[PDB]
């Protein structure tokens with residue numbers, strides 16, 4: 001009921017797709033950042049929302065800026081998020097799998113940089 005994911009200096013996540021076993025009550029994403037660039041220039045986060053909500057989350061996050069991890073505080077569209085990390089840093093986020101609803105399309109993404117993928121219940 002966890003996955004390890006990396007974001008590198010070339011703005012790439014090392015997976016495009018996360019699958020969550022339906023046996024899981026909670027799920028944990030462990031984000032890391034191979035490379036050499038720091039948080040203020042090549043910081044990554046990992047953010048989960050519906051596909052429909054992603055644009056507003058990113059836009060509002062960029063308006064909130066760097067010290068708010070490029071996320072709007074208390075954004076109710078964000079189902080789960082890590083903090084922003086630079087190279088060498090790590091952050092894990094855990095969420096309740098029952099927040100993922102049948103029939104919905106979930107996406108994971110970084111807010112400052114064009115990086116995204118799918119999250120699906122197995």
Ligand SMILES: [Cu+]
Nearest residue numbers: 043044110113
């Ligand atoms: Cu990123």
